[PDB]
């Protein structure tokens, strides 16, 4: 039960002038913060998004980011001018930052930077560095970003101390939302597929771990194709399992669904 905290940033630069930066923050599969370009301040999307920080501690932290966002926008603009005409607009930059919480007050922080949808740069130790696969021209940006000692000290304190502290508080304040149990509802349906395809729908369950198999009596069908986990708007999950069968063979088949919320009483739907 190791929760990963993710501060996702997306920045788009269309030309020299026009740009926008939007962020979202995840603790596991729950959104905690939102920061639209239009908004001057970071928005809580949960009651407990402030964690265990005081109002004074949060203001300090928010201000750090407010300066960051404006600063970052100008830096990228200047870095483009520096590399010009090697690299040109439009430019897409993504940041994935945060810390992965382990038991026994253990964690591991990270700050990954993608450029045009490719992971090129990370903050490691006490400096920025390129990763394997990165183009060599980024060495000048990296040299320049590593010149700024103030930024380095700040990010170090942010990744080493501030992240694990904050996230450890989040886990306490948002315990009831994190550990919530939402029950799945299931329903059946069928379509042709080159031979019909039976579909077992499972919707409205939390947390994400779930077990869904087609069965005839007590015989797990090997042809059961589990689909992707699709989200609902109310922060519950949707999954479907399909089984390809022949016409007149649908009789006998059932869809069994196991989930922690149901607590023993598995859902069994017969065709």
């Amino acid at each position: 039960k190791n929760y990963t905290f993710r501060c996702l940033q997306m920045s788009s630069f269309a030309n020299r002038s026009w740009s926008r930066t939007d962020s979202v923050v995840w603790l596991g599969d729950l959104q905690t913060h939102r920061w639209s370009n239009d908004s001057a301040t970071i928005s809580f999307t949960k009651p407990w998004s402030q964690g265990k920080l005081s109002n004074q501690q949060w203001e300090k932290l928010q201000h750090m980011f407010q300066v960051y966002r404006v600063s970052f926008t100008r830096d990228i603009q200047e870095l483009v001018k520096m590399m010009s005409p090697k690299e040109d607009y439009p430019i897409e930059i993504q940041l994935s930052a945060g810390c992965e919480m382990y038991p026994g007050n253990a964690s591991e922080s990270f700050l990954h930077v993608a450029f045009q949808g490719k992971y090129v740069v990370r903050f490691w130790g006490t400096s920025w560095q390129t990763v394997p696969g990165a183009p060599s021209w980024l060495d000048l940006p990296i040299k320049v970003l590593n010149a700024d000692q103030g930024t380095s000290a700040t990010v170090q304190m942010l990744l080493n101390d501030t992240c694990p502290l904050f996230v450890r508080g989040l886990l306490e304040a948002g315990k009831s939302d994190l550990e919530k149990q939402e029950k799945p509802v299931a329903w059946l349906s069928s379509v042709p597929s080159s031979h019909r395809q039976l579909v077992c729908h499972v919707s409205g369950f939390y947390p994400k771990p779930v077990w869904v198999m087609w069965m005839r009596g007590d015989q797990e069908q090997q042809g059961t194709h589990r689909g992707d986990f699709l989200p609902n708007a109310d922060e519950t999950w949707y999954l479907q399992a399909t089984l390809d069968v022949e016409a007149g063979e649908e009789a006998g088949l059932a869809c069994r669904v196991k989930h922690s919320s149901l607590g023993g009483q598995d859902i069994i739907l017969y065709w």
Epitope: K143, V144, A147, D148, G150
Partner: T-cell receptor
């Protein structure tokens, strides 16, 4: 202008001390540099302040910075005739070449010998 | 001692004339900068360059063209000089750090 200096000008007698003020609104504020400009000549760096509550010294020149207040002062102890100059306050908004320098208009010091 | 030189150091020009302020730097600095100094104002940026071939607009670029033919030389070109461009012009250079090393200045007077 994001960098204001005070006083605009002042006159002192040789041997006396003076305090020069710099107040800025630059955001962010990485470092602050004090220059000396003799009449006609170029810019001579006296000191550079980087920390949140920094103090520096350079012989007769000492300076302080408080980033919370966005305030810095240059102290000249025991003024000599050669101190007759303009004293310029510059704030840098980055710790790298990506930074823009924000210049004060200066403070004219005259030392009566 | 990263030194920077400017030429000319002092220049008298006529309105509508062409004036070229040069700046040489042997420190192998990628970055060079052009400022002018006027009373009531601090130094104001005109043009800067991040390397040979690059020129970028400052805060007050109007009436000036920049030129970075090499790593060493950065020129400020007044194509059609005007009295308003009477000033003291300072060139500077620097590496990836925040420090800019300033030249000794150029006094330009533009007469009618």
């Amino acid at each position: 202008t994001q960098v204001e200096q005070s006083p605009q000008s002042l006159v002192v007698r040789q041997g006396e001390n003076c305090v020069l003020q710099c107040n800025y609104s630059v955001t962010p504020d990485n470092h602050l540099r004090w220059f000396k400009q003799d009449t006609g000549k170029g810019l001579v760096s006296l000191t550079v302040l980087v920390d949140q509550k920094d103090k520096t010294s350079n012989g007769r020149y000492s300076a302080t910075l408080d980033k919370d207040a966005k305030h810095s002062t240059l102290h000249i102890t025991a003024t000599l005739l050669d101190d007759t100059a303009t004293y310029i306050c510059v704030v840098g908004d980055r710790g790298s070449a990506l930074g823009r320098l924000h210049f004060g208009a200066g403070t004219q010091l005259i030392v009566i010998p | 001692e990263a030194a920077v030189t400017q030429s000319p150091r002092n220049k008298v020009a006529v309105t509508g004339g062409k004036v070229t302020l040069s700046c040489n730097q042997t420190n192998n600095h990628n970055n060079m900068y052009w400022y002018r100094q006027d009373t009531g104002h601090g130094l104001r940026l005109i043009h800067y360059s991040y390397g040979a071939g690059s020129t970028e607009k400052g805060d007050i670029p109007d009436g000036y063209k920049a030129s970075r033919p090499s790593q060493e030389n950065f020129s400020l070109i007044l194509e059609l000089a005007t009295p308003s461009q009477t000033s003291v012009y300072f060139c500077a250079s620097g590496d990836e750090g925040y420090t800019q090393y300033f030249g000794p200045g150029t006094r330009l007077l533009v007469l009618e």
